[PDB]
Write a structure and sequence with these properties.
The complex is a heterodimer of chains A (20) and B (141). Helices cover 90% and strands 0% of the residues of chain A. With 20 residues, chain A is mainly α. By secondary structure, chain B is mainly alpha-helical. Chain B is globular. The chains are: A mainly alpha (20), B mainly alpha (141). The complex binds zinc ion (2 copies). It is classed as peptide binding protein.
């Protein structure tokens, strides 16, 4: 579980960075 | 015969195959994907290495697991461009690994699997977001 979830979370963090 | 699929495959395949040894939107999207994706790999190398270690890819059977990860992420109803670029970036990171273990022949199929799942699960979201033109705009400058 941790692996999938860590990737998803990174993607969301990158999304927030560029949506800024 | 599905232009969005064809375009997505061209962009994603070119990026992943670049780790081994046509329209305006596709060219710009490839440049954007490489620019952002290579940055993600550089800044997240330790994390990506740990994920790759968990996948423990040493043979053809292990490459199956990777297609299952892609399906798993894109099946999530949550969608955004950050997720899309990050998953493709991890795909390119694994493609580098595949090259180093002499499994270059897995790279094009990996790109096809990523493209298949992305378009099958997110087609409507992608079009609503203006497709690859929207991708270029989101990550612009
Ligand atoms: Zn190149
Ligand atoms: Zn293979």
């Amino acid at each position: 579980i941790w692996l999938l979830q860590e990737l998803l979370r990174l993607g969301d963090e990158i999304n927030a960075r560029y949506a800024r | 015969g599905d232009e969005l699929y064809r375009q997505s495959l061209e962009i994603i395949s070119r990026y992943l195959r670049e780790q081994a040894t046509s329209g305006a939107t596709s060219r710009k999207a490839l440049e954007t994907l490489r620019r952002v994706g290579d940055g993600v790999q550089r800044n997240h190398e330790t994390a990506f290495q740990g994920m790759l270690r968990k996948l423990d890819i040493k043979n053809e059977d292990d490459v199956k697991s990777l297609s299952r990860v892609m399906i798993h992420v894109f099946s999530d109803g949550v969608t955004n461009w950050g997720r899309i670029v990050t998953l493709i970036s991890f795909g390119a990171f694994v493609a580098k690994h595949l090259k180093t273990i002499n499994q270059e022949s897995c790279i094009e199929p990996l790109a096809e699997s990523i493209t298949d799942v992305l378009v099958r699960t997110k087609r409507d979201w992608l079009v609503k977001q203006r497709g690859w033109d929207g991708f270029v705009e989101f990550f612009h400058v």
